[PDB]
Amino acid sequence: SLALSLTADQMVSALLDAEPPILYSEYDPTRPFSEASMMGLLTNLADRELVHMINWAKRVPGFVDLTLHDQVHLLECAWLEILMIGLVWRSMEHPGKLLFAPNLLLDRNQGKCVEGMVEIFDMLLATSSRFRMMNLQGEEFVCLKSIILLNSGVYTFSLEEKDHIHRVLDKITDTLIHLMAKAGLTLQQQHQRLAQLLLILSHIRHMSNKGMEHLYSMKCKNVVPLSDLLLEMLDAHRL
């Protein structure tokens, strides 16, 4: 297989080059928000981000080796997690603020403009301060984001196949350890940091579950219209 014969530095190189761009919103700073227009702004942004995420997933080493059916399942399961960790990563250098877009930097008090959204904001912000606390590196981030894509839906699947996905996961694990070894970390410090990073994904899954329920609430409310792709990704979670 392709991703099987890949050195640690080459793994990082491939992931870094596969990174999607940072998109802009249609935000006009000369006005306050409502509840609908902001969700309209955030939906319009998330929908365009999805297109780049989907083409990004193809460039993730080992993903294209999977069947079309399995590719669909993994993305349907992890799309919000990946959107969220990207958001958290963009917001690292902006304490107390969430950088949805370079022209859209929101704090906790603007999240209140949408009902119940400030809860998700707090968790996202706490995750961002956690990344800043750990001094998360760009090389580590792209590894984590690829792990989410492959791991989040692997348990919901002859079936192995499976073993290929886990083999790729193990390859990304070797890569993270390789990175930490370069940063001067001892054996003990590498295992610890590895553990700390992977435990973040638990909270990321949590935020995604809460966020998914929030979007489903938005849909039925007919508050504001979701895009047709965003609806399909939402319906996939059977909420």
Binding site: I54, K58, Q71, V72, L75, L229, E232
Partner: peptide, 9 residues
């Protein structure tokens, strides 16, 4: 699925 089509090309 739109996800299908986007994953195709």
């Amino acid at each position: 699925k739109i996800l299908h089509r986007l994953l195709q090309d």
